[PDB]
Subunit: 186 residues, 3 copies
C-alpha cells in the first residue's frame, strides 16, 4: 500500500473504499470498527510519547500497535471463499501472546477489592485512556460482526477483548506504588 | 467487587454481564453509557497526571472520579421493585454539590461574548478534552434512558450534564491569564 | 453569543437547542456532528499545549480551531430558504486553503510504502490522536447529512475530510527523523 498525495477527493460524497475497493458509506459498521482501531492505536502512541515507558513496555506496546494494523487489515477485507490472494487475518496466535503478557505482568501484582481511579503516572493515566478506547473499538468490532456475521471475523474483536485486559495490567505496573481505589458513595 | 485474573474469556462471544449478572450484548445502550463514563474518568486522570493541578482542584477532580464510578454502578444495575439489597444510586445530592463548585469557581471569572479555543495550559487543554468526553457520556446516558425508561435512572445523565459545565469553568481557571476567543469567519 | 452562568438546567430532560433554538434530543445526529467537532477541537488544543509546535504550525492549527467553530455553527443552524439573517456557512474557500497547506507541507516529505505507527514526538502523537478524532467527526457529519439532506450542508463534512489528511501530513513533519512503518504480520 502507498501513501503519496494523501488527499484524493474520492470520499467527498460520503463514500469510501474497503480493502477490496468495493464502496461503502463512511458510516459503515466495518469501517467504524477499523477506524476505532486507528483511534486506539493513536492512544497508545500518546502513551509511548509522553509516558516514558521502560524498554520492555515500549517493545510490547510497539508490537500491539503493529497488531492493530493487522486487525484493521482483517476488518477492512471482506471474507470470501478461495480469495485469489490470501488475506492477512488475526489468529489465535495473537490472543495467546496477549494472555502470556497478561499472566507475566500480572504475576507481581496483588488482588484488588475495588476499581482503581485512573491517573498517577503520565504512562499509567495514558494507558487507562488507551484501555477505554480499545474497549470502544471492541464494541465496534462486535457490531461489525452483527452486521456481517459471514464476512467479518470474530478474532479481531477477541483480540481487542484481551488487549484491554492487558492494558489495565500495564496501567497498574506503571504505578509501582499503587493507585487510588474507588470507595462506593464515599 | 474483585479484580484478580482480569481475563476470564466469558465475553469472547460478544456478550457480557450487567451488575445483576444478566447477560447483554456488548453494544447494549446501558453498557455504552457506563463505558463512556469509564472513558471520561480516564480523561480526568490524564488531566490530573499531566496537568499539575493545584491541591484544591485535585481534590475536586478526585471526588468526581469517585462519583463517576457511583454513576457507572447506577447505570450498570437495573432498577427493580424492592431489591433484595439496596443499590448504589446517584442522588440530587451529587448534582447540588456540582452546582456549588460551579458557582464558587465561576465567581472570580468574567462573562464571555464568544466561545474559547481549547488549549493553553496542559491542565486547561486536558480539562477541555475531559469536558467533551463527559458530554459524549451524557448523550450515551440519555440514550440508555430512551432504551429503558423504567430500568435506568435519569440522575446519572443529569449529573453528567452539570459536570461538563463545571469542567468548562475549571478549564478557564487553569488559564488564569485568558483563553483565545472564537472570531466567527475570522 | 454569551457564556454567563453556564448551567441553566434547561437540558435536564435530555433535550437541548439548535442555534435557531428549536428543540432536539441530545442524541440528534446534527448535535452529534458538531459535538464531535468540539471533541476534535479539544484534541488540537491538547496538541498545542503539550506538543510545543513551532510558530508556523501553531498559526495553522489556531486557524483550524477557529474553522471548527465555523463548522459547528454551520451544522447547528438548519438550512432555510431566505433566512432573516444570513447564516455562517463553510465554503469551498475553507477546503482550498486546507489543500494548499497539504501541498506545501507535503512537498518536503517522501512517499510511504505502508502505514506509520502513531507516536514519536508529543506533537506528532497528539496530531495522530487529533487526526482520528477529526475522522470520527467526519463520519458524524455525514450521518447528519443522511438524516437531513436538505437542512444540513455537505461542506462541513468535506472540510473535515480534507482536515484529517492535513493533520496526517503535519504528524509526519513533527517527526522530522521518521516514523516507524507497519510491517504486516511482523
Ligand atoms: C467489566 C464490565 O464492563 C462491561 N464491559 C464488557 N466489555 C466492555 C467493553 N468492550 N466496553 C465497555 N464496557 C465493557 C461489562 O459490564 C463487564 O462486566
Ligand atoms: C451548548 C450547546 O451544545 C449542544 N449540546 C447540549 N448538550 C450536549 C451534549 N451532551 N453533548 C454535545 N453537545 C451538546 C446544544 O446545542 C447546546 O445548546
Ligand atoms: C483510508 C481508509 O480509511 C477508511 N476511511 C475513510 N474515511 C474515513 C473516516 N472518516 N473515518 C475512518 N476511516 C475512514 C476508508 O476505508 C479509506 O479507504
Ligand atoms: Mg485522504
Ligand atoms: Mg473483556
Ligand atoms: Mg476482562
Ligand atoms: Mg448541558
Ligand atoms: Mg450548560
Ligand atoms: Mg478522507
Amino acid at each position: 500500500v502507498h501513501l503519496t498525495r494523501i488527499y484524493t477527493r474520492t470520499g467527498d460524497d460520503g463514500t469510501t473504499g474497503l480493502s477490496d475497493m468495493s464502496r461503502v458509506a463512511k458510516t459503515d459498521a466495518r469501517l467504524v470498527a477499523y477506524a476505532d482501531c486507528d483511534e486506539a492505536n493513536a492512544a497508545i502512541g500518546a502513551a509511548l510519547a509522553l509516558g516514558h515507558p521502560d524498554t520492555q513496555i515500549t517493545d510490547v506496546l510497539r508490537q500491539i500497535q503493529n497488531d492493530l494494523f493487522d486487525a484493521g487489515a482483517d476488518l477492512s477485507t471482506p471474507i470470501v471463499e478461495n480469495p485469489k490472494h490470501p488475506p492477512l487475518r488475526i489468529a489465535q496466535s495473537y490472543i495467546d501472546r496477549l494472555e502470556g503478557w497478561c499472566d507475566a505482568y500480572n504475576a507481581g501484582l496483588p488482588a484488588l477489592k475495588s476499581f482503581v481511579l485512573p491517573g498517577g503516572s503520565p504512562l499509567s493515566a495514558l494507558l487507562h485512556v488507551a484501555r477505554t478506547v480499545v474497549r470502544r473499538a471492541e464494541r465496534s468490532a462486535w457490531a461489525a460482526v452483527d452486521a456481517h456475521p459471514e464476512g467479518v471475523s470474530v478474532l479481531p474483536a477477541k483480540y481487542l477483548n484481551r488487549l484491554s485486559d492487558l492494558l489495565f495490567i500495564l496501567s497498574r505496573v506503571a504505578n509501582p506504588d499503587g493507585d487510588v481505589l474507588w470507595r462506593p458513595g464515599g
